[PDB]
Amino acid sequence: GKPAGLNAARKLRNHRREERWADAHYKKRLLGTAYKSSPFGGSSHAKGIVVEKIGVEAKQPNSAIRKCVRVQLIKNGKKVTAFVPHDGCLNFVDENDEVLLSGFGRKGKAKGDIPGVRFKVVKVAGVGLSALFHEKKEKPRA
Amino acid sequence: GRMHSKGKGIASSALPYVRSPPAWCKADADSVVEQILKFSKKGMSPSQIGVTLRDSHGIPQVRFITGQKIMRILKANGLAPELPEDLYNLIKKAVSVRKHLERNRKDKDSKFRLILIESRIHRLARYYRKVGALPPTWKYESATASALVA
Amino acid sequence: VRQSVLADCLNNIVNAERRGRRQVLIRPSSKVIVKFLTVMQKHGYIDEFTEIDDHRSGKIVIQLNGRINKCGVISPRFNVKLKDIEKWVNQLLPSRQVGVIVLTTSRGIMSHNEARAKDAGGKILGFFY
RNA sequence: AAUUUUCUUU
RNA sequence: AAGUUGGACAAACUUGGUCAUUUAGAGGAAGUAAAAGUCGUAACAAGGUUUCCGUAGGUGAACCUGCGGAAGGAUCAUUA
RNA sequence: UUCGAUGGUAGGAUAGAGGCCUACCAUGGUUUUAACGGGUAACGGGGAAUUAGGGUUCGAUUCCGGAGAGGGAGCCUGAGAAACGGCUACCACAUCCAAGGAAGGCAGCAGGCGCGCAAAUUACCCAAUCCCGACACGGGGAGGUAGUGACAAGAAAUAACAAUGCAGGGUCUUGUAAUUGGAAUGAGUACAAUGUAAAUACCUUAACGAGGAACAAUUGGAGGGCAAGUCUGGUGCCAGCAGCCGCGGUAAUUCCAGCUCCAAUAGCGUAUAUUAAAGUUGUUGCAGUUAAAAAGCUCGUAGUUGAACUUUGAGCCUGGUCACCGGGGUCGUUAACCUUCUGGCAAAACCAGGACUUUUACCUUGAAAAAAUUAGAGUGUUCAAAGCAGGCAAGUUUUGCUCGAAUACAUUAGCAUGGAAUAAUAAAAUAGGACGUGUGGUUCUAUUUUGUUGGUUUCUAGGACCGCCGUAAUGAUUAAUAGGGAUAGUCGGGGGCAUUCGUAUUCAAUUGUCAGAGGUGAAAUUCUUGGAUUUAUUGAAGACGAACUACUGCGAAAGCAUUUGCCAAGGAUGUUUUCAUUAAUCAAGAACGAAAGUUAGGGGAUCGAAGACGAUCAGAUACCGUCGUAGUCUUAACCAUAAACUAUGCCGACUAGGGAUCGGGCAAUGUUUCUCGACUUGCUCGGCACCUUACGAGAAAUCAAAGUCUUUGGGUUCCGGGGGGAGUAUGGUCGCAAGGCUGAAACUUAAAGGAAUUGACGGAAGGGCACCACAAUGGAGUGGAGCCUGCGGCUUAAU
């Protein structure tokens, strides 16, 4: 079973220290992967430039076009994939719009049927989504 | 729980409650002490001393009449072997196994048994050096084990 | 090999009590076992016990009367201060009124309540309720 | 002896 | 004072070995995901040669075979 | 450890110890209790968040300590600096240049650029706290105050009194008000007092200041989770919604428009980090037979854990909050503050005070201990976040009184007092011993005096060493249903060596007649009137020990099956034998380790990887037949894994009834066969297992352990944290090689998996039913011919 001696504190502490690496949560914190190879170095949001738009296909059992775009980060140089939440915004969003990218809400995991996408766009041209949609704000003449 | 085996035997001797000299006996204490000395000069181990005295002469337990263990009697009267009997028997068995192995090198079972005997000898030697029955630099070498026995 | 004799004694006693037998034979015996049993006796959970004095550790025959649920040991012997008695009671005892924790206090083997009265901690031996 | 295959749903 | 001779601390530069991190490259070999491809059918029934493991060989492929093991077998069973 | 790493001597330097430095002399110091190296997106602490407890995370930042002033290095001044709003040189930058040169450092207060998801005025003042100086008088971007915001905490605008009929209710009361109207209205507007260095603000000031755009509350959701629509319109697996399950293919309670409802509220959502849930890190408190997980097995040192036993109980005095409890002393069991120093009594001995643990761990208390912060006592910031004040006192106005600003948390670690239960080591073995106003001796010192320092003998008082004197009860815990060893009879398909025997297979020679022989579902390849096959005799080769052979034995496991002999060893049993804790489990390190695989030698009968053909099939590359190389055997070197299984680590205690079996022992005025054996019965120990049952356990299959676990703790190793990636890549290590050991990350995914149940299926089995099934030499037929008619296809205008 487990050691139960009064002088086995070192043995118990060492075994717990070795075994805690098997924990998925502890490993993801102690490896530093957020600052080592992750697209986001712990940042909640990051600015980027739109590269292109990709029509990803939904997985089973759904079937639709996800209306995604590809965005190149300006502070890291890593090319990632972005998801536009609403409908009819890919026409408004053109190349080089200075978009803002954030997480999806699954702690960096793909949400729903969208394959291989982990980020979502929040602002376009520095004005914010759902503002130009309701015709409250307008895209600057850039 | 055998130290080097899976056996769980409990065979042993159950000494009586009466820790007294026998009710019907004429051992006379000192006569038995000199008798043990005579047998020690004859050259038999203390286990053989007790076995012969119990089986033939009729004294159940020697310490009951003498007041001390037979090893204590031998040490007090000077006939104390340098090597303890149990360690001497273990080393003699190791020598016999080593001789068998050197004449027949293919006995892997004998090699395994020699490893067990070597471990038992070292553990017993460590205990005896710790308690003080042997010099602290006692050590155990297979080359001189034959001379140690003889 | 045998490590603690109190654990074997308490395991045998609780096994006999669960089985419903009115007697149990305990071997080996010791001073710690004796002090634990008299503490249980003065608290009323265990009836008379006869210590069979052999030229060995010795045996003991215990008369049971039910009314106990479980008697166990706490290994290793954790050091229990006065402030930790309440935490141990909440951790091990069924309630604040029913249950006894035995501590080998420097004054002697005693229940947790009278150890509190004497204002002296020690090392935890076991419990019974 | 010999017997391979049954698209994605309602 | 200007100036002179030695000593110690000693920034900094060229080179060589070592450590840590980061970063190109002609080319090569992998995994990872598919609304409705091509080849055949290995496994799930005795899956139609019972299955699996270790090892070795071979073949377009699932895979087949040799040797030794297991039933997680399709037998808890022939006392005559 | 060179070029100081560890220590000694001497010196130098420093304000000062010190390998800080130097010369010489020795090789030393740390480390599996993790030394050293590397990483840290690491200043440390008081502390903060979550809160059953235990814990986890954070802490640049209002307090303390350290470092820095772009990176180093040196130096003057000064008590105090290796100072940068002091200096000097190099390195990287910026600047005026007349081209000779000059000159700096905002990680200070403001402000600018850039990196950015991410964070403010180029403001006023020394009035309060304090600091500096020659000093009431000066200065202080320390500090106080204000401008800016969505957020850090505390309080609260968007209302409300009636007439009114309907739904009402039971003569008292709620609601829809295209209704009125007089009320209390505060946000603001102004002004006055107060506030303050000056102000702003707060408080406070009359007074102006709503009849509806009054001076319009938002944010999300309305399928489950989780609270609130199958309502009306638009699209139709498309747009899309959607934290997961999941909705959408013309009836969409889940897509977008309207209506209404639900939750919080001047706030709500989203993205990320973290905490609780997570009993999915599990010391408390996980799990390992089948879901992930017991090393193939054994030895073995660190590490962890370690049988019992050495003073227990009874009777008092006195004083303490409630028949009760804690605390101090005693006498006898058995001698009752051991021993020492000092003071007294004195025949050694006694009393009083101090020291008093051999030596700890442990528990209790005390001391000194930063504040804030946490808990928390008191107290009218209108309550509160607050703050540490404050109060008396309406009838005199009295130039007064009165209080508080606690306490704890803290104790890791150090110091001290008290206890000696729990866990340890020696108290003396060759007695190397309490031995002591004891019989004798020697070494030193003067703690005193012979007049003062100084030199010797030593009375005197003290420290230590040498042989003897029994003062007296002169000294060794039992030997654990622990262990080791010995002994006696046994037992074993345990190991090795030598030796013996058995048939079978193949082959070889010889003899007898002849036509097929092998093989297979069917065959087919192949060889056979040159004698195949068979029968008969003899011989050789290699392999293996059939039947006996079993819910039987042995070994640590892998494994071990012919006879005999030899050698070493082993378990159990018997034992009034021996030692006495010698013990259990293990990192690191080692032994053995099936089969297959490798290097050399021998041998190669049978089988047989690769392969060759011959059948089956559409394709057979395989399953089938024959032949057939490596291999299958063995020796000397290798490796080192299998479903190496009981998918179940080792040691120890307890737990229900019975019957078989192996080894040993005990008992029978038991049986039998020419002193023993065989058989029968009962008891017991140690194994292999079995049947029933479930006090008990599990998710169940099931389990005498997988039980004694939410009532969770006997001890100790190995191993797992959802599924793929992946036992892959890289690194290290061993191996001639094959390969063995150790062993990730990115990314992807909402499942993977285990047990069991009901259907369905099976080229699975067992019972049966059927001319929409077959058998029967079945009867009649159809399809083959021509036509009636129907269905596809063709054509047309519809066919």
JSON list of N, CA and C (backbone and C1' of nucleotides) in Angstrom, two decimals, chain F residues 30-51:
[
{"chain": "F", "resi": 30, "resn": "U", "atom": "P", "xyz": [32.57, 16.66, 5.37]},
{"chain": "F", "resi": 30, "resn": "U", "atom": "O5'", "xyz": [31.66, 16.98, 4.11]},
{"chain": "F", "resi": 30, "resn": "U", "atom": "C5'", "xyz": [30.84, 18.14, 4.07]},
{"chain": "F", "resi": 30, "resn": "U", "atom": "C4'", "xyz": [30.02, 18.19, 2.81]},
{"chain": "F", "resi": 30, "resn": "U", "atom": "C3'", "xyz": [29.21, 16.94, 2.50]},
{"chain": "F", "resi": 30, "resn": "U", "atom": "O3'", "xyz": [27.98, 16.91, 3.21]},
{"chain": "F", "resi": 30, "resn": "U", "atom": "C1'", "xyz": [30.37, 17.63, 0.56]},
{"chain": "F", "resi": 31, "resn": "U", "atom": "P", "xyz": [27.40, 15.52, 3.78]},
{"chain": "F", "resi": 31, "resn": "U", "atom": "O5'", "xyz": [26.82, 14.79, 2.49]},
{"chain": "F", "resi": 31, "resn": "U", "atom": "C5'", "xyz": [25.87, 15.44, 1.65]},
{"chain": "F", "resi": 31, "resn": "U", "atom": "C4'", "xyz": [25.78, 14.77, 0.30]},
{"chain": "F", "resi": 31, "resn": "U", "atom": "C3'", "xyz": [25.54, 13.28, 0.32]},
{"chain": "F", "resi": 31, "resn": "U", "atom": "O3'", "xyz": [24.17, 12.96, 0.50]},
{"chain": "F", "resi": 31, "resn": "U", "atom": "C1'", "xyz": [27.29, 13.77, -1.18]},
{"chain": "F", "resi": 32, "resn": "U", "atom": "P", "xyz": [23.74, 11.74, 1.45]},
{"chain": "F", "resi": 32, "resn": "U", "atom": "O5'", "xyz": [22.34, 11.28, 0.86]},
{"chain": "F", "resi": 32, "resn": "U", "atom": "C5'", "xyz": [22.14, 11.21, -0.55]},
{"chain": "F", "resi": 32, "resn": "U", "atom": "C4'", "xyz": [21.01, 10.28, -0.92]},
{"chain": "F", "resi": 32, "resn": "U", "atom": "C3'", "xyz": [21.05, 8.92, -0.23]},
{"chain": "F", "resi": 32, "resn": "U", "atom": "O3'", "xyz": [19.72, 8.46, -0.03]},
{"chain": "F", "resi": 32, "resn": "U", "atom": "C1'", "xyz": [21.23, 8.63, -2.57]},
{"chain": "F", "resi": 33, "resn": "U", "atom": "P", "xyz": [19.16, 8.24, 1.46]},
{"chain": "F", "resi": 33, "resn": "U", "atom": "O5'", "xyz": [19.06, 9.71, 2.06]},
{"chain": "F", "resi": 33, "resn": "U", "atom": "C5'", "xyz": [18.08, 10.63, 1.59]},
{"chain": "F", "resi": 33, "resn": "U", "atom": "C4'", "xyz": [18.15, 11.95, 2.31]},
{"chain": "F", "resi": 33, "resn": "U", "atom": "C3'", "xyz": [19.45, 12.74, 2.11]},
{"chain": "F", "resi": 33, "resn": "U", "atom": "O3'", "xyz": [19.17, 14.14, 2.13]},
{"chain": "F", "resi": 33, "resn": "U", "atom": "C1'", "xyz": [19.16, 12.27, 4.41]},
{"chain": "F", "resi": 34, "resn": "A", "atom": "P", "xyz": [18.59, 14.88, 0.82]},
{"chain": "F", "resi": 34, "resn": "A", "atom": "O5'", "xyz": [19.85, 15.65, 0.21]},
{"chain": "F", "resi": 34, "resn": "A", "atom": "C5'", "xyz": [21.03, 14.94, -0.18]},
{"chain": "F", "resi": 34, "resn": "A", "atom": "C4'", "xyz": [21.34, 15.13, -1.64]},
{"chain": "F", "resi": 34, "resn": "A", "atom": "C3'", "xyz": [20.45, 16.13, -2.37]},
{"chain": "F", "resi": 34, "resn": "A", "atom": "O3'", "xyz": [21.21, 16.80, -3.38]},
{"chain": "F", "resi": 34, "resn": "A", "atom": "C1'", "xyz": [20.25, 14.01, -3.39]},
{"chain": "F", "resi": 35, "resn": "A", "atom": "P", "xyz": [21.40, 18.39, -3.33]},
{"chain": "F", "resi": 35, "resn": "A", "atom": "O5'", "xyz": [22.97, 18.59, -3.16]},
{"chain": "F", "resi": 35, "resn": "A", "atom": "C5'", "xyz": [23.58, 18.50, -1.88]},
{"chain": "F", "resi": 35, "resn": "A", "atom": "C4'", "xyz": [25.05, 18.18, -1.99]},
{"chain": "F", "resi": 35, "resn": "A", "atom": "C3'", "xyz": [25.80, 18.92, -3.09]},
{"chain": "F", "resi": 35, "resn": "A", "atom": "O3'", "xyz": [26.18, 20.23, -2.72]},
{"chain": "F", "resi": 35, "resn": "A", "atom": "C1'", "xyz": [26.31, 16.63, -3.21]},
{"chain": "F", "resi": 36, "resn": "C", "atom": "P", "xyz": [25.63, 21.49, -3.57]},
{"chain": "F", "resi": 36, "resn": "C", "atom": "O5'", "xyz": [26.31, 21.31, -5.00]},
{"chain": "F", "resi": 36, "resn": "C", "atom": "C5'", "xyz": [27.72, 21.25, -5.14]},
{"chain": "F", "resi": 36, "resn": "C", "atom": "C4'", "xyz": [28.10, 20.71, -6.50]},
{"chain": "F", "resi": 36, "resn": "C", "atom": "C3'", "xyz": [27.47, 21.41, -7.69]},
{"chain": "F", "resi": 36, "resn": "C", "atom": "O3'", "xyz": [28.14, 22.60, -8.07]},
{"chain": "F", "resi": 36, "resn": "C", "atom": "C1'", "xyz": [27.19, 19.08, -7.93]},
{"chain": "F", "resi": 37, "resn": "G", "atom": "P", "xyz": [27.31, 23.87, -8.59]},
{"chain": "F", "resi": 37, "resn": "G", "atom": "O5'", "xyz": [26.74, 23.41, -10.00]},
{"chain": "F", "resi": 37, "resn": "G", "atom": "C5'", "xyz": [27.62, 23.13, -11.08]},
{"chain": "F", "resi": 37, "resn": "G", "atom": "C4'", "xyz": [26.89, 22.47, -12.23]},
{"chain": "F", "resi": 37, "resn": "G", "atom": "C3'", "xyz": [25.70, 23.23, -12.80]},
{"chain": "F", "resi": 37, "resn": "G", "atom": "O3'", "xyz": [26.08, 24.27, -13.69]},
{"chain": "F", "resi": 37, "resn": "G", "atom": "C1'", "xyz": [25.10, 20.97, -12.47]},
{"chain": "F", "resi": 38, "resn": "G", "atom": "P", "xyz": [25.24, 25.63, -13.74]},
{"chain": "F", "resi": 38, "resn": "G", "atom": "O5'", "xyz": [23.86, 25.22, -14.43]},
{"chain": "F", "resi": 38, "resn": "G", "atom": "C5'", "xyz": [23.84, 24.74, -15.76]},
{"chain": "F", "resi": 38, "resn": "G", "atom": "C4'", "xyz": [22.48, 24.18, -16.13]},
{"chain": "F", "resi": 38, "resn": "G", "atom": "C3'", "xyz": [21.30, 25.12, -15.97]},
{"chain": "F", "resi": 38, "resn": "G", "atom": "O3'", "xyz": [21.17, 26.02, -17.06]},
{"chain": "F", "resi": 38, "resn": "G", "atom": "C1'", "xyz": [20.76, 23.02, -15.03]},
{"chain": "F", "resi": 39, "resn": "G", "atom": "P", "xyz": [20.56, 27.49, -16.81]},
{"chain": "F", "resi": 39, "resn": "G", "atom": "O5'", "xyz": [19.00, 27.23, -16.60]},
{"chain": "F", "resi": 39, "resn": "G", "atom": "C5'", "xyz": [18.21, 26.68, -17.64]},
{"chain": "F", "resi": 39, "resn": "G", "atom": "C4'", "xyz": [16.81, 26.38, -17.17]},
{"chain": "F", "resi": 39, "resn": "G", "atom": "C3'", "xyz": [16.05, 27.55, -16.56]},
{"chain": "F", "resi": 39, "resn": "G", "atom": "O3'", "xyz": [15.48, 28.41, -17.53]},
{"chain": "F", "resi": 39, "resn": "G", "atom": "C1'", "xyz": [15.80, 25.63, -15.20]},
{"chain": "F", "resi": 40, "resn": "U", "atom": "P", "xyz": [15.42, 29.99, -17.26]},
{"chain": "F", "resi": 40, "resn": "U", "atom": "O5'", "xyz": [14.38, 30.14, -16.06]},
{"chain": "F", "resi": 40, "resn": "U", "atom": "C5'", "xyz": [13.03, 29.74, -16.21]},
{"chain": "F", "resi": 40, "resn": "U", "atom": "C4'", "xyz": [12.31, 29.71, -14.89]},
{"chain": "F", "resi": 40, "resn": "U", "atom": "C3'", "xyz": [12.37, 30.99, -14.08]},
{"chain": "F", "resi": 40, "resn": "U", "atom": "O3'", "xyz": [11.44, 31.97, -14.51]},
{"chain": "F", "resi": 40, "resn": "U", "atom": "C1'", "xyz": [12.87, 29.16, -12.68]},
{"chain": "F", "resi": 41, "resn": "A", "atom": "P", "xyz": [11.96, 33.37, -15.09]},
{"chain": "F", "resi": 41, "resn": "A", "atom": "O5'", "xyz": [10.93, 34.43, -14.50]},
{"chain": "F", "resi": 41, "resn": "A", "atom": "C5'", "xyz": [10.41, 35.48, -15.31]},
{"chain": "F", "resi": 41, "resn": "A", "atom": "C4'", "xyz": [9.04, 35.13, -15.83]},
{"chain": "F", "resi": 41, "resn": "A", "atom": "C3'", "xyz": [8.25, 34.11, -15.02]},
{"chain": "F", "resi": 41, "resn": "A", "atom": "O3'", "xyz": [7.62, 34.67, -13.88]},
{"chain": "F", "resi": 41, "resn": "A", "atom": "C1'", "xyz": [8.15, 33.53, -17.30]},
{"chain": "F", "resi": 42, "resn": "A", "atom": "P", "xyz": [7.85, 34.01, -12.43]},
{"chain": "F", "resi": 42, "resn": "A", "atom": "O5'", "xyz": [9.37, 34.34, -12.09]},
{"chain": "F", "resi": 42, "resn": "A", "atom": "C5'", "xyz": [10.23, 33.34, -11.56]},
{"chain": "F", "resi": 42, "resn": "A", "atom": "C4'", "xyz": [10.44, 33.53, -10.08]},
{"chain": "F", "resi": 42, "resn": "A", "atom": "C3'", "xyz": [11.12, 34.83, -9.66]},
{"chain": "F", "resi": 42, "resn": "A", "atom": "O3'", "xyz": [10.22, 35.93, -9.63]},
{"chain": "F", "resi": 42, "resn": "A", "atom": "C1'", "xyz": [12.11, 33.02, -8.52]},
{"chain": "F", "resi": 43, "resn": "C", "atom": "P", "xyz": [10.79, 37.43, -9.57]},
{"chain": "F", "resi": 43, "resn": "C", "atom": "O5'", "xyz": [11.20, 37.61, -8.04]},
{"chain": "F", "resi": 43, "resn": "C", "atom": "C5'", "xyz": [11.86, 38.78, -7.60]},
{"chain": "F", "resi": 43, "resn": "C", "atom": "C4'", "xyz": [12.83, 38.48, -6.49]},
{"chain": "F", "resi": 43, "resn": "C", "atom": "C3'", "xyz": [12.22, 38.03, -5.17]},
{"chain": "F", "resi": 43, "resn": "C", "atom": "O3'", "xyz": [11.87, 36.66, -5.16]},
{"chain": "F", "resi": 43, "resn": "C", "atom": "C1'", "xyz": [13.82, 39.71, -4.75]},
{"chain": "F", "resi": 44, "resn": "G", "atom": "P", "xyz": [10.53, 36.18, -4.41]},
{"chain": "F", "resi": 44, "resn": "G", "atom": "O5'", "xyz": [10.93, 36.14, -2.87]},
{"chain": "F", "resi": 44, "resn": "G", "atom": "C5'", "xyz": [11.79, 35.13, -2.37]},
{"chain": "F", "resi": 44, "resn": "G", "atom": "C4'", "xyz": [12.15, 35.37, -0.93]},
{"chain": "F", "resi": 44, "resn": "G", "atom": "C3'", "xyz": [10.98, 35.54, 0.04]},
{"chain": "F", "resi": 44, "resn": "G", "atom": "O3'", "xyz": [10.39, 34.31, 0.43]},
{"chain": "F", "resi": 44, "resn": "G", "atom": "C1'", "xyz": [12.55, 37.24, 0.42]},
{"chain": "F", "resi": 45, "resn": "G", "atom": "P", "xyz": [8.81, 34.25, 0.71]},
{"chain": "F", "resi": 45, "resn": "G", "atom": "O5'", "xyz": [8.62, 35.03, 2.09]},
{"chain": "F", "resi": 45, "resn": "G", "atom": "C5'", "xyz": [9.14, 34.49, 3.29]},
{"chain": "F", "resi": 45, "resn": "G", "atom": "C4'", "xyz": [9.16, 35.51, 4.40]},
{"chain": "F", "resi": 45, "resn": "G", "atom": "C3'", "xyz": [7.81, 35.99, 4.91]},
{"chain": "F", "resi": 45, "resn": "G", "atom": "O3'", "xyz": [7.18, 35.08, 5.79]},
{"chain": "F", "resi": 45, "resn": "G", "atom": "C1'", "xyz": [9.23, 37.85, 4.60]},
{"chain": "F", "resi": 46, "resn": "G", "atom": "P", "xyz": [5.57, 35.01, 5.86]},
{"chain": "F", "resi": 46, "resn": "G", "atom": "O5'", "xyz": [5.16, 36.34, 6.64]},
{"chain": "F", "resi": 46, "resn": "G", "atom": "C5'", "xyz": [5.48, 36.50, 8.02]},
{"chain": "F", "resi": 46, "resn": "G", "atom": "C4'", "xyz": [5.12, 37.88, 8.52]},
{"chain": "F", "resi": 46, "resn": "G", "atom": "C3'", "xyz": [3.66, 38.27, 8.43]},
{"chain": "F", "resi": 46, "resn": "G", "atom": "O3'", "xyz": [2.87, 37.75, 9.49]},
{"chain": "F", "resi": 46, "resn": "G", "atom": "C1'", "xyz": [4.99, 40.03, 7.60]},
{"chain": "F", "resi": 47, "resn": "G", "atom": "P", "xyz": [1.57, 36.85, 9.19]},
{"chain": "F", "resi": 47, "resn": "G", "atom": "O5'", "xyz": [0.96, 37.47, 7.85]},
{"chain": "F", "resi": 47, "resn": "G", "atom": "C5'", "xyz": [0.22, 38.69, 7.87]},
{"chain": "F", "resi": 47, "resn": "G", "atom": "C4'", "xyz": [0.06, 39.25, 6.49]},
{"chain": "F", "resi": 47, "resn": "G", "atom": "C3'", "xyz": [-1.09, 38.68, 5.66]},
{"chain": "F", "resi": 47, "resn": "G", "atom": "O3'", "xyz": [-2.34, 39.28, 5.96]},
{"chain": "F", "resi": 47, "resn": "G", "atom": "C1'", "xyz": [0.88, 38.69, 4.36]},
{"chain": "F", "resi": 48, "resn": "A", "atom": "P", "xyz": [-3.70, 38.45, 5.78]},
{"chain": "F", "resi": 48, "resn": "A", "atom": "O5'", "xyz": [-3.91, 38.37, 4.20]},
{"chain": "F", "resi": 48, "resn": "A", "atom": "C5'", "xyz": [-4.22, 39.53, 3.45]},
{"chain": "F", "resi": 48, "resn": "A", "atom": "C4'", "xyz": [-4.42, 39.20, 1.99]},
{"chain": "F", "resi": 48, "resn": "A", "atom": "C3'", "xyz": [-5.45, 38.13, 1.69]},
{"chain": "F", "resi": 48, "resn": "A", "atom": "O3'", "xyz": [-6.78, 38.64, 1.67]},
{"chain": "F", "resi": 48, "resn": "A", "atom": "C1'", "xyz": [-3.47, 37.66, 0.50]},
{"chain": "F", "resi": 49, "resn": "A", "atom": "P", "xyz": [-8.01, 37.70, 2.10]},
{"chain": "F", "resi": 49, "resn": "A", "atom": "O5'", "xyz": [-8.23, 36.75, 0.83]},
{"chain": "F", "resi": 49, "resn": "A", "atom": "C5'", "xyz": [-8.61, 37.29, -0.43]},
{"chain": "F", "resi": 49, "resn": "A", "atom": "C4'", "xyz": [-8.73, 36.22, -1.47]},
{"chain": "F", "resi": 49, "resn": "A", "atom": "C3'", "xyz": [-9.52, 34.98, -1.06]},
{"chain": "F", "resi": 49, "resn": "A", "atom": "O3'", "xyz": [-10.92, 35.16, -1.20]},
{"chain": "F", "resi": 49, "resn": "A", "atom": "C1'", "xyz": [-7.49, 34.32, -2.07]},
{"chain": "F", "resi": 50, "resn": "U", "atom": "P", "xyz": [-11.94, 34.56, -0.11]},
{"chain": "F", "resi": 50, "resn": "U", "atom": "O5'", "xyz": [-11.95, 33.00, -0.43]},
{"chain": "F", "resi": 50, "resn": "U", "atom": "C5'", "xyz": [-12.41, 32.51, -1.68]},
{"chain": "F", "resi": 50, "resn": "U", "atom": "C4'", "xyz": [-12.23, 31.02, -1.78]},
{"chain": "F", "resi": 50, "resn": "U", "atom": "C3'", "xyz": [-12.67, 30.22, -0.56]},
{"chain": "F", "resi": 50, "resn": "U", "atom": "O3'", "xyz": [-14.07, 29.97, -0.54]},
{"chain": "F", "resi": 50, "resn": "U", "atom": "C1'", "xyz": [-10.52, 29.51, -1.24]},
{"chain": "F", "resi": 51, "resn": "U", "atom": "P", "xyz": [-14.93, 30.31, 0.77]},
{"chain": "F", "resi": 51, "resn": "U", "atom": "O5'", "xyz": [-14.63, 29.10, 1.75]},
{"chain": "F", "resi": 51, "resn": "U", "atom": "C5'", "xyz": [-14.63, 27.75, 1.28]},
{"chain": "F", "resi": 51, "resn": "U", "atom": "C4'", "xyz": [-13.63, 26.90, 2.02]},
{"chain": "F", "resi": 51, "resn": "U", "atom": "C3'", "xyz": [-14.05, 26.49, 3.43]},
{"chain": "F", "resi": 51, "resn": "U", "atom": "O3'", "xyz": [-13.54, 25.18, 3.71]},
{"chain": "F", "resi": 51, "resn": "U", "atom": "C1'", "xyz": [-12.04, 27.73, 3.53]}
]
